[PDB]
Design an enzyme around this catalytic site. Structure first.
Site, PDB file in Angstrom:
ATOM      1  CG  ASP A  81      -2.000   0.969   1.162  1.00 25.91           C
ATOM      2  OD1 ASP A  81      -1.767   2.178   1.151  1.00 25.91           O
ATOM      3  OD2 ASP A  81      -3.197   0.511   1.140  1.00 25.91           O
ATOM      4  CG  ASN A 135     -11.819   0.051   4.149  1.00 29.71           C
ATOM      5  OD1 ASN A 135     -12.010  -0.502   5.217  1.00 29.71           O
ATOM      6  ND2 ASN A 135     -10.820   0.891   3.888  1.00 29.71           N
ATOM      7  CD  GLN A 185     -14.987   0.167  -2.207  1.00 31.29           C
ATOM      8  OE1 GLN A 185     -16.102  -0.142  -1.761  1.00 31.29           O
ATOM      9  NE2 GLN A 185     -14.439  -0.506  -3.231  1.00 31.29           N
ATOM     10  CB  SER A 186     -10.481   5.714  -1.441  1.00 35.72           C
ATOM     11  OG  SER A 186      -9.394   4.794  -1.277  1.00 35.72           O
ATOM     12  CG  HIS A 246      -8.768  -2.841  -2.150  1.00 39.30           C
ATOM     13  ND1 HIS A 246      -9.724  -2.134  -2.856  1.00 39.30           N
ATOM     14  CD2 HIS A 246      -8.394  -2.078  -1.122  1.00 39.30           C
ATOM     15  CE1 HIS A 246      -9.884  -0.971  -2.292  1.00 39.30           C
ATOM     16  NE2 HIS A 246      -9.083  -0.921  -1.230  1.00 39.30           N
ATOM     17  CG  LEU A 247      -7.880  -9.069   2.368  1.00 39.56           C
ATOM     18  CD1 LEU A 247      -9.187  -8.990   3.147  1.00 39.56           C
ATOM     19  CD2 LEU A 247      -7.378 -10.501   2.256  1.00 39.56           C
ATOM     20  CG  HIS A 248      -6.763  -2.541   3.372  1.00 35.18           C
ATOM     21  ND1 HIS A 248      -5.938  -1.474   3.085  1.00 35.18           N
ATOM     22  CD2 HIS A 248      -7.995  -2.263   2.889  1.00 35.18           C
ATOM     23  CE1 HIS A 248      -6.680  -0.603   2.476  1.00 35.18           C
ATOM     24  NE2 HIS A 248      -7.940  -1.027   2.318  1.00 35.18           N
TER      25      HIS A 248
HETATM   26  N1  DGP Z   1       0.243   0.774  -4.117  1.00 43.87           N
HETATM   27  C1  DGP Z   1      -0.748   1.654  -4.266  1.00 43.87           C
HETATM   28  N2  DGP Z   1      -1.694   1.718  -3.307  1.00 43.87           N
HETATM   29  C2  DGP Z   1      -2.645   2.627  -3.616  1.00 43.87           C
HETATM   30  C3  DGP Z   1      -2.685   3.452  -4.767  1.00 43.87           C
HETATM   31  N3  DGP Z   1      -3.812   4.201  -4.728  1.00 43.87           N
HETATM   32  C4  DGP Z   1      -4.453   3.949  -3.648  1.00 43.87           C
HETATM   33  N4  DGP Z   1      -3.783   2.984  -2.926  1.00 43.87           N
HETATM   34  C5  DGP Z   1      -4.203   2.425  -1.611  1.00 43.87           C
HETATM   35  C6  DGP Z   1      -4.452   3.489  -0.586  1.00 43.87           C
HETATM   36  C7  DGP Z   1      -5.592   2.970   0.254  1.00 43.87           C
HETATM   37  O1  DGP Z   1      -5.023   2.171   1.491  1.00 43.87           O
HETATM   38  C8  DGP Z   1      -6.352   1.992  -0.672  1.00 43.87           C
HETATM   39  C9  DGP Z   1      -7.549   2.693  -1.154  1.00 43.87           C
HETATM   40  O2  DGP Z   1      -8.550   2.971  -0.163  1.00 43.87           O
HETATM   41  P1  DGP Z   1      -9.698   1.933   0.246  1.00 43.87           P
HETATM   42  O3  DGP Z   1     -10.550   1.752  -0.968  1.00 43.87           O
HETATM   43  O4  DGP Z   1     -10.322   2.610   1.419  1.00 43.87           O
HETATM   44  O5  DGP Z   1      -9.071   0.639   0.620  1.00 43.87           O
HETATM   45  O6  DGP Z   1      -5.449   1.742  -1.748  1.00 43.87           O
HETATM   46  C10 DGP Z   1      -1.641   3.333  -5.726  1.00 43.87           C
HETATM   47  O7  DGP Z   1      -1.487   4.074  -6.732  1.00 43.87           O
HETATM   48  N5  DGP Z   1      -0.704   2.398  -5.384  1.00 43.87           N
END
Ligand code: DGP
Lengths: 117, 112
Positions: A34, A90, A97-98, A103-105
Protein backbone atom coordinates in the site's frame (compact mmCIF):
# COMPACT_ATOMS: atom_id res chain seq x y z
CA UNK A 1 -11.30 -4.95 -25.32
CA UNK A 2 -8.22 -2.56 -25.57
CA UNK A 3 -7.72 -2.79 -21.73
CA UNK A 4 -9.27 -5.81 -19.87
CA UNK A 5 -9.99 -5.10 -16.29
CA UNK A 6 -10.88 -1.38 -16.47
CA UNK A 7 -9.21 1.92 -15.71
CA UNK A 8 -9.24 2.18 -11.94
CA UNK A 9 -5.73 2.65 -10.57
CA UNK A 10 -5.81 -1.05 -9.55
CA UNK A 11 -6.91 -2.18 -13.05
CA UNK A 12 -3.94 -0.28 -14.43
CA UNK A 13 -1.54 -1.75 -11.84
CA UNK A 14 -2.73 -5.23 -12.94
CA UNK A 15 -1.79 -4.40 -16.53
CA UNK A 16 1.67 -3.04 -15.49
CA UNK A 17 0.63 0.47 -16.67
CA UNK A 18 1.25 2.06 -13.21
CA UNK A 19 4.16 0.84 -11.06
CA UNK A 20 3.63 -1.05 -7.82
CA UNK A 21 5.79 -2.97 -5.37
CA UNK A 22 4.56 -6.56 -6.15
CA UNK A 23 4.77 -9.29 -3.47
CA UNK A 24 2.91 -12.14 -5.22
CA UNK A 25 1.08 -12.66 -8.50
CA UNK A 26 -0.97 -15.53 -9.92
CA UNK A 27 -3.67 -15.90 -12.57
CA UNK A 28 -6.39 -14.82 -10.13
CA UNK A 29 -4.87 -12.10 -7.97
CA UNK A 30 -2.09 -9.66 -7.21
CA UNK A 31 -0.53 -8.68 -3.84
CA UNK A 32 1.36 -5.37 -3.59
CA UNK A 33 2.35 -2.85 -0.92
CA UNK A 34 0.00 0.00 0.00
CA UNK A 35 1.37 3.44 -0.96
CA UNK A 36 -0.07 5.04 2.22
CA UNK A 37 0.78 2.40 4.86
CA UNK A 38 -1.11 2.43 8.15
CA UNK A 39 1.15 -0.13 9.82
CA UNK A 40 4.82 -1.08 9.49
CA UNK A 41 3.70 -3.67 6.94
CA UNK A 42 0.57 -2.85 4.92
CA UNK A 43 -0.23 -4.57 1.65
CA UNK A 44 -3.23 -5.23 -0.59
CA UNK A 45 -4.49 -8.43 -2.24
CA UNK A 46 -6.73 -7.76 -5.24
CA UNK A 47 -8.48 -9.93 -7.80
CA UNK A 48 -7.41 -9.63 -11.44
CA UNK A 49 -11.13 -9.83 -12.29
CA UNK A 50 -12.66 -6.38 -11.85
CA UNK A 51 -15.37 -6.32 -9.17
CA UNK A 52 -16.21 -2.80 -7.93
CA UNK A 53 -17.12 -3.63 -4.33
CA UNK A 54 -18.31 -6.66 -2.25
CA UNK A 55 -21.64 -5.57 -2.09
CA UNK A 56 -21.89 -6.54 -5.86
CA UNK A 57 -19.81 -9.77 -5.77
CA UNK A 58 -21.57 -12.78 -7.30
CA UNK A 59 -22.12 -16.12 -5.51
CA UNK A 60 -19.60 -17.75 -7.92
CA UNK A 61 -16.96 -15.26 -6.67
CA UNK A 62 -16.65 -17.22 -3.40
CA UNK A 63 -13.46 -19.09 -4.27
CA UNK A 64 -11.86 -15.91 -5.64
CA UNK A 65 -12.65 -13.98 -2.46
CA UNK A 66 -11.37 -16.84 -0.35
CA UNK A 67 -8.23 -16.95 -2.48
CA UNK A 68 -7.54 -13.32 -1.53
CA UNK A 69 -7.48 -14.38 2.12
CA UNK A 70 -5.33 -17.49 1.50
CA UNK A 71 -2.83 -15.43 -0.54
CA UNK A 72 -2.92 -12.71 2.14
CA UNK A 73 -2.10 -15.19 4.91
CA UNK A 74 0.71 -16.74 2.85
CA UNK A 75 2.19 -13.33 1.98
CA UNK A 76 2.01 -12.32 5.66
CA UNK A 77 4.02 -15.38 6.64
CA UNK A 78 6.53 -14.69 3.80
CA UNK A 79 6.88 -11.13 5.17
CA UNK A 80 7.67 -12.38 8.68
CA UNK A 81 4.44 -11.23 10.39
CA UNK A 82 4.84 -13.88 13.05
CA UNK A 83 2.89 -12.00 15.74
CA UNK A 84 -0.18 -11.67 13.49
CA UNK A 85 -2.00 -9.17 11.38
CA UNK A 86 -5.41 -7.71 10.49
CA UNK A 87 -7.29 -8.22 7.23
CA UNK A 88 -9.75 -5.50 6.17
CA UNK A 89 -12.27 -4.92 3.38
CA UNK A 90 -13.67 -1.41 3.13
CA UNK A 91 -17.21 -1.34 1.49
CA UNK A 92 -18.69 1.88 0.30
CA UNK A 93 -18.87 5.27 1.92
CA UNK A 94 -19.23 4.16 5.54
CA UNK A 95 -16.45 1.59 5.04
CA UNK A 96 -14.12 4.37 3.81
CA UNK A 97 -13.68 2.80 0.36
CA UNK A 98 -11.69 5.02 -2.07
CA UNK A 99 -10.79 2.63 -4.96
CA UNK A 100 -13.75 0.82 -6.53
CA UNK A 101 -11.90 -2.39 -7.35
CA UNK A 102 -12.27 -5.01 -4.55
CA UNK A 103 -9.23 -5.36 -2.33
CA UNK A 104 -8.17 -6.93 0.93
CA UNK A 105 -5.85 -4.95 3.19
CA UNK A 106 -3.33 -6.87 5.33
CA UNK A 107 -1.77 -4.82 8.17
CA UNK A 108 0.85 -5.89 10.70
CA UNK A 109 4.18 -5.29 12.37
CA UNK A 110 2.57 -3.47 15.30
CA UNK A 111 -0.20 -4.05 17.82
CA UNK A 112 -3.56 -3.39 16.11
CA UNK A 113 -6.20 -1.76 18.29
CA UNK A 114 -9.92 -2.26 18.91
CA UNK A 115 -12.28 -1.01 17.54
CA UNK A 116 -10.93 -1.41 13.98
CA UNK A 117 -11.73 2.19 13.12
CA UNK B 1 -9.38 -26.59 21.67
CA UNK B 2 -13.10 -25.64 21.84
CA UNK B 3 -14.15 -22.03 22.30
CA UNK B 4 -17.22 -20.03 23.20
CA UNK B 5 -17.97 -19.85 19.45
CA UNK B 6 -18.14 -23.66 19.41
CA UNK B 7 -20.73 -23.48 22.17
CA UNK B 8 -22.71 -20.89 20.17
CA UNK B 9 -22.63 -23.14 17.04
CA UNK B 10 -23.86 -26.10 19.13
CA UNK B 11 -26.69 -23.89 20.52
CA UNK B 12 -25.41 -24.51 24.08
CA UNK B 13 -25.41 -20.82 24.94
CA UNK B 14 -27.47 -18.16 23.29
CA UNK B 15 -26.57 -15.60 20.67
CA UNK B 16 -28.69 -13.36 18.45
CA UNK B 17 -28.54 -15.45 15.28
CA UNK B 18 -28.98 -13.64 11.94
CA UNK B 19 -28.38 -16.49 9.46
CA UNK B 20 -27.40 -20.14 9.40
CA UNK B 21 -26.66 -22.71 6.72
CA UNK B 22 -24.93 -26.11 6.67
CA UNK B 23 -21.44 -24.60 6.92
CA UNK B 24 -21.56 -21.23 8.73
CA UNK B 25 -23.39 -19.14 11.32
CA UNK B 26 -23.89 -15.36 11.48
CA UNK B 27 -24.77 -13.69 14.80
CA UNK B 28 -24.58 -10.26 16.44
CA UNK B 29 -21.37 -9.53 18.40
CA UNK B 30 -21.97 -9.38 22.17
CA UNK B 31 -19.59 -6.38 22.38
CA UNK B 32 -20.62 -4.36 19.33
CA UNK B 33 -18.25 -1.63 18.12
CA UNK B 34 -20.73 -0.09 15.68
CA UNK B 35 -24.53 0.25 15.56
CA UNK B 36 -24.45 -2.98 13.52
CA UNK B 37 -21.66 -5.41 14.35
CA UNK B 38 -22.01 -9.10 13.56
CA UNK B 39 -19.81 -12.12 13.00
CA UNK B 40 -19.82 -14.79 10.29
CA UNK B 41 -18.05 -17.96 11.39
CA UNK B 42 -17.50 -21.35 9.76
CA UNK B 43 -18.89 -24.42 11.50
CA UNK B 44 -15.54 -26.09 10.79
CA UNK B 45 -13.17 -25.28 13.72
CA UNK B 46 -10.37 -23.46 11.85
CA UNK B 47 -8.56 -21.79 14.75
CA UNK B 48 -7.16 -18.82 12.85
CA UNK B 49 -6.65 -17.69 9.26
CA UNK B 50 -2.89 -18.41 9.40
CA UNK B 51 -3.64 -22.21 9.52
CA UNK B 52 -6.44 -22.24 6.91
CA UNK B 53 -5.88 -24.86 4.20
CA UNK B 54 -6.03 -24.21 0.46
CA UNK B 55 -9.14 -26.64 0.36
CA UNK B 56 -10.91 -24.02 2.65
CA UNK B 57 -10.69 -21.26 0.15
CA UNK B 58 -14.33 -21.38 -1.06
CA UNK B 59 -15.59 -21.72 2.54
CA UNK B 60 -13.71 -18.52 3.47
CA UNK B 61 -15.24 -16.75 0.48
CA UNK B 62 -18.65 -18.08 1.55
CA UNK B 63 -18.21 -16.22 4.87
CA UNK B 64 -17.79 -12.98 2.88
CA UNK B 65 -20.79 -13.66 0.58
CA UNK B 66 -22.95 -14.49 3.62
CA UNK B 67 -21.62 -11.35 5.32
CA UNK B 68 -22.51 -9.20 2.28
CA UNK B 69 -26.05 -10.65 2.16
CA UNK B 70 -26.59 -10.23 5.90
CA UNK B 71 -25.31 -6.62 5.71
CA UNK B 72 -27.84 -5.85 3.00
CA UNK B 73 -30.65 -7.47 5.07
CA UNK B 74 -29.60 -5.35 8.10
CA UNK B 75 -29.89 -2.16 6.04
CA UNK B 76 -26.20 -1.31 5.61
CA UNK B 77 -26.81 0.49 2.29
CA UNK B 78 -24.08 3.05 2.95
CA UNK B 79 -21.41 0.41 3.42
CA UNK B 80 -19.50 -1.41 6.11
CA UNK B 81 -16.12 -2.81 7.07
CA UNK B 82 -15.15 -6.48 7.10
CA UNK B 83 -12.33 -7.59 9.42
CA UNK B 84 -10.44 -10.82 10.11
CA UNK B 85 -7.99 -10.68 13.01
CA UNK B 86 -4.97 -13.01 13.31
CA UNK B 87 -2.99 -13.58 16.48
CA UNK B 88 -1.91 -11.13 19.13
CA UNK B 89 -0.88 -8.24 16.92
CA UNK B 90 -4.18 -8.67 15.01
CA UNK B 91 -6.12 -8.51 18.25
CA UNK B 92 -7.78 -11.89 17.65
CA UNK B 93 -10.11 -12.41 20.60
CA UNK B 94 -11.31 -16.03 19.99
CA UNK B 95 -9.29 -18.84 18.33
CA UNK B 96 -12.07 -19.80 15.92
CA UNK B 97 -11.91 -17.95 12.57
CA UNK B 98 -14.45 -15.20 12.34
CA UNK B 99 -15.34 -12.42 9.96
CA UNK B 100 -16.48 -9.18 11.61
CA UNK B 101 -18.94 -6.96 9.73
CA UNK B 102 -19.32 -3.43 11.14
CA UNK B 103 -21.53 -0.60 9.93
CA UNK B 104 -24.21 1.92 10.68
CA UNK B 105 -21.59 4.62 11.34
CA UNK B 106 -18.60 6.05 9.54
CA UNK B 107 -15.67 3.66 9.91
CA UNK B 108 -12.34 5.46 10.35
CA UNK B 109 -8.75 5.14 9.13
CA UNK B 110 -6.47 3.61 10.29
CA UNK B 111 -8.54 0.49 11.07
CA UNK B 112 -7.03 0.19 14.54
N1 DGP C 1 0.24 0.77 -4.12
C1 DGP C 1 -0.75 1.65 -4.27
N2 DGP C 1 -1.69 1.72 -3.31
C2 DGP C 1 -2.65 2.63 -3.62
C3 DGP C 1 -2.69 3.45 -4.77
N3 DGP C 1 -3.81 4.20 -4.73
C4 DGP C 1 -4.45 3.95 -3.65
N4 DGP C 1 -3.78 2.98 -2.93
C5 DGP C 1 -4.20 2.42 -1.61
C6 DGP C 1 -4.45 3.49 -0.59
C7 DGP C 1 -5.59 2.97 0.25
O1 DGP C 1 -5.02 2.17 1.49
C8 DGP C 1 -6.35 1.99 -0.67
C9 DGP C 1 -7.55 2.69 -1.15
O2 DGP C 1 -8.55 2.97 -0.16
P1 DGP C 1 -9.70 1.93 0.25
O3 DGP C 1 -10.55 1.75 -0.97
O4 DGP C 1 -10.32 2.61 1.42
O5 DGP C 1 -9.07 0.64 0.62
O6 DGP C 1 -5.45 1.74 -1.75
C10 DGP C 1 -1.64 3.33 -5.73
O7 DGP C 1 -1.49 4.07 -6.73
N5 DGP C 1 -0.70 2.40 -5.38
Amino acid sequence: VARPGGDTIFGKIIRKEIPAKIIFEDDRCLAFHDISPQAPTHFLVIPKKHISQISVAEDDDESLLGHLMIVGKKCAADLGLNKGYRMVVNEGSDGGQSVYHVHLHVLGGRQMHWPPG
